[PDB]
Write a protein that binds this ligand. Structure first.
Ligand code: HEC
Length: 107
């Protein structure tokens, strides 16, 4: 149960808040964070070639709309010890728009 998202608004959030550390396209490079291609339906810790924390790997969830919605509000609360430094997107609408963009761009 996430709010319906606007892909265009979500693309702007992604570029301004996430692209510093993440790519989305197939074959895109790892940066500080993992490439996100195939994210939806991917369990944590699965991007080929990225060195994840044990904390991320142990969370034992599948990335999809609902889990991203909670994670992105406050990453460290959801995965204590994660190496991702990002305070969170507090507004539910910003998370919804971003998630819709990610769903389209990581296919
Ligand atoms: C660099 C300062 C980051 C910013 C800004 C964002 N992310 Fe990130 N992310 C980063 C790291 C180093 C990692 C790995 C964490 C670990 O503990 O190993 C991550 C991880 C994610 C994940 C999980 C991916 C997976 O399990 O394969 C997601 C879904 C994620 N990051 C999303 C994401 C988004 C959408 C961001 C903007 C709101 C964002 N992150 C910013 C580093 C950084």
């Amino acid at each position: 149960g996430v709010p319906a998202g606007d892909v265009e608004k979500g693309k702007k959030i992604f570029v301004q808040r996430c692209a510093q550390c993440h790519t989305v396209e197939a074959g895109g490079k790892h940066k500080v964070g993992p490439n996100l291609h195939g994210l939806f339906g991917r369990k944590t810790g699965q991007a080929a070639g990225f060195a994840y924390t044990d904390a991320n790997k142990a969370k034992g969830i599948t990335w999809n709309e609902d889990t991203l919605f909670e994670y992105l509000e406050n990453p460290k609360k959801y995965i204590p010890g994660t190496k991702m430094i990002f305070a969170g997107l507090k507004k539910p609408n910003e998370r919804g728009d971003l998630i819709a963009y990610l769903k389209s761009a990581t296919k």
